[PDB]
């Protein structure tokens, strides 16, 4: 993929954001921005420039599902890739997310290999 692709990493924990950012760096992706919740994320996204979103599920203010639905209904970002990275793993939620258009899902804790593979996968697709 375009090494210049702009990623948005959304998670309440800076440590998790750090992990994701580092792995992206490993893959050759350095154009990364961070967000603490769905609202901040959406705010940045609407400002323009993004090519990929990595987000947690349960978040204050605006959760991953709402973020996802909002993105999918947007006139410009409807197809924006959205990778869920979260501790959440209930069948119901996987379904709802699948239904809503999530591009992928990685369960925390994840191995570097897992995240990287899923990433590559989405780029595929």
């Amino acid at each position: 993929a375009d090494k210049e692709l702009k990623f948005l990493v959304v998670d309440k924990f800076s440590t998790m954001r750090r992990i994701v950012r580092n792995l992206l760096k490993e893959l050759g992706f350095n154009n990364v921005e961070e967000a603490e919740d769905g609202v901040d994320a959406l705010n940045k996204l609407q400002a323009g420039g993004y090519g990929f979103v990595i987000s947690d599920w349960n978040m204050p203010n605006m959760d991953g599902l709402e973020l996802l639905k909002t993105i999918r209904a947007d006139g410009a970002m409807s197809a924006l890739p959205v990778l869920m990275v979260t501790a959440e793993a209930k069948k119901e939620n996987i379904i709802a997310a699948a239904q809503a258009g999530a591009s992928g899902w990685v369960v925390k804790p994840f191995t570097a290999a897992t995240l990287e593979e899923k990433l590559n996968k989405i780029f595929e697709k």
Partner: peptide, 13 residues
Amino acid sequence: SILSQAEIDALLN
């Protein structure tokens, strides 16, 4: 019902 990465993989990845 908790799905494993593998299981989830079958529907989302």
